[PDB]
Amino acid sequence: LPPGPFPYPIVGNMLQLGANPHQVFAKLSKRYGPLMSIHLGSLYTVIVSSPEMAKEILHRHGQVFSGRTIAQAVHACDHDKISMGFLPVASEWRDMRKICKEQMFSNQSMEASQGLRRQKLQQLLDHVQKCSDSGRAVDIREAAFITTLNLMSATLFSSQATEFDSKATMEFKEIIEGVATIVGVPNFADYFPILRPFDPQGVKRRADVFFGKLLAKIEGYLNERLESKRANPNAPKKDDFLEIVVDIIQANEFKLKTHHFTHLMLDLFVGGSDTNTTSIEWAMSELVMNPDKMARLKAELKSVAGDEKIVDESAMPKLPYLQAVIKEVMRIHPPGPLLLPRKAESDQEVNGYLIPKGTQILINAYAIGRDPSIWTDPETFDPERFLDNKIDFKGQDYELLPFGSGRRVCPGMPLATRILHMATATLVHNFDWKLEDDSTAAADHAGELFGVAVRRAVPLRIIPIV
Ligand code: HEM
Numbered sequence: 001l002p003p004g005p006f007p008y009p010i011v012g013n014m015l016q017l018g019a020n021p022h023q024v025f026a027k028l029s030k031r032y033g034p035l036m037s038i039h040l041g042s043l044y045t046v047i048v049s050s051p052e053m054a055k056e057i058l059h060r061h062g063q064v065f066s067g068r069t070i071a072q073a074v075h076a077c078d079h080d081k082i083s084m085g086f087l088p089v090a091s092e093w094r095d096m097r098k099i100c101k102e103q104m105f106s107n108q109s110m111e112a113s114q115g116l117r118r119q120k121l122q123q124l125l126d127h128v129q130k131c132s133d134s135g136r137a138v139d140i141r142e143a144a145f146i147t148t149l150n151l152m153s154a155t156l157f158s159s160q161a162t163e164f165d166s167k168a169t170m171e172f173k174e175i176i177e178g179v180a181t182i183v184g185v186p187n188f189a190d191y192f193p194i195l196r197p198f199d200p201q202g203v204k205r206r207a208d209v210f211f212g213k214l215l216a217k218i219e220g221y222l223n224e225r226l227e228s229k230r231a232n233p234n235a236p237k238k239d240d241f242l243e244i245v246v247d248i249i250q251a252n253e254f255k256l257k258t259h260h261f262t263h264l265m266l267d268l269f270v271g272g273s274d275t276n277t278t279s280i281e282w283a284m285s286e287l288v289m290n291p292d293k294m295a296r297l298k299a300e301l302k303s304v305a306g307d308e309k310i311v312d313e314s315a316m317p318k319l320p321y322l323q324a325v326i327k328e329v330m331r332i333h334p335p336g337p338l339l340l341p342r343k344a345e346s347d348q349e350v351n352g353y354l355i356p357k358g359t360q361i362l363i364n365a366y367a368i369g370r371d372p373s374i375w376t377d378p379e380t381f382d383p384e385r386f387l388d389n390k391i392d393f394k395g396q397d398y399e400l401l402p403f404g405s406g407r408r409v410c411p412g413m414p415l416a417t418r419i420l421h422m423a424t425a426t427l428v429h430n431f432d433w434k435l436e437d438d439s440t441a442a443a444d445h446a447g448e449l450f451g452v453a454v455r456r457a458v459p460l461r462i463i464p465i466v
Pocket residue numbers: 084085086267268269271272273275276279334335336339340341401402403404405406407408409410411412413415416417420
């Protein structure tokens with residue numbers, strides 16, 4: 001087995017992880033190496049911590065490690081059996097991947113929904129404008145949460161609500177925050193198999209409530225669309241994912257039931273929420289803390305969009321510094337520092353070490369992003385290091401893996417980047433910013449809080465001035 005810290009009876013290595021396990025893994029793998037045995041109670045895990053080993057796992061043996069480790073909370077409403085995010089690589093999974101790649105996140109699809117999202121950006125712009133007038137600091141975490149939810153809502157369901165904080169959106173927010181609370185803490189049933197039949201913390205149960213609420217909203221939206229289309233055969237086709245769902249179903253070309261699609265949209269909606277929400281806050285945090293870089297971005301934006309207040313997504317190639325900023329934010333702050341778990345589908349040897357069937361595989365992309373042997377001045381925020389640099393985050397550069405790589409690489413990436421780029425652009429271009437209070441400034445930026453997404457312990461609060 002790969003080397004690693006001495007595992008104690010019963011607990012294994014669990015007592016050493018602390019509140020930011022990804023940080024502790026990063027420090028540990030310096031001692032033990034880029035393939036490391038970690039015992040999470042009875043749940044044997046191998047941590048992968050270099051570009052070399054990432055490629056060995058995700059690429060060379062990409063099929064063997066194409067499986068997922070399934071938390072107990074994922075068993076709610078039988079999601080573990082239905083979801084594109086957790087099913088093994090097989091027929092049902094390929095079909096849903098195909099639908100995502102070829103239809104949902106295609107170029108045609110993303111461009112067709114560009115206007116729907118534009119309104120949501122306009123709403124955010126107006127919100128920040130009010131706070132700007134009154135001189136009130138904006139809570140970036142809360143603002144980004146709502147904007148992301150809006151952008152995701154607009155793209156998936158065409159929801160054109162006129163209030164920034166619409167009722168429909170704040171329901172979602174309650175539900176998503178709900179899921180995060182439950183999953184973001186250790187389920188001991190995940191680590192001690194004798195506890196699984198008990199669900200001793202009621203994690204599965206509490207999650208079944210929030211999954212149910214969410215599946216309801218979605219099945220509601222679907223049913224309403226199906227009726228509206230039946231009653232209005234001559235209405236223009238909506239430009240969203242929901243419209244795409246209906247057509248695929250009513251064409252019956254895929255061996256998939258209805259709940260595949262309702263669960264699929266749930267994964268898309270949830271998968272895109274916390275990720276973009278915390279990334280936007282990190283972006284804004286980094287720029288405010290590095291006034292030189294904030295200036296360089298502002299200058300590039302001024303030069304390209306001028307007096308336009310909302311950039312066209314199609315204008316992204318005209319914005320290399322904005323891309324570099326987001327690339328660099330992903331390097332330092334991958335939302336999921338340990339990505340999503342993979343799993344060995346059979347015994348497999350890697351670098352002389354046996355990796356047994358069933359092993360949980362965690363890619364520490366966080367570690368890799370901050371490894372000084374790969375990145376110069378790793379803790380420094382420096383977008384300039386990506387300019388004229390072919391290194392990207394699509395999965396081909398194992399120095400930079402915030403989206404994963406190989407088989408289960410993030411399918412929502414085309415929507416994600418648009419959301420990151422535009423929301424960041426809207427905020428930076430239209431306002432200047434100062435901290436509400438710079439007294440604990442440095443500390444507030446460095447302090448992380450683990451969970452579904454690693455985020456700032458202290459939520460960013462900054463005042464918008466024009
Ligand atoms: C905004 C930044 C985002 C990041 C950093 C991110 C990151 C990731 C990562 C690391 C994985 C696992 C990759 C692997 O196992 O190799 C993943 C998978 C996934 N992501 Fe995201 N994601 C983001 C946004 C989104 C969005 C906007 C959506 C949907 C609209 C989405 C939907 C999904 C889904 C459905 C999977 C499961 C893929 C599978 O197992 O086949 N993500 N993501």
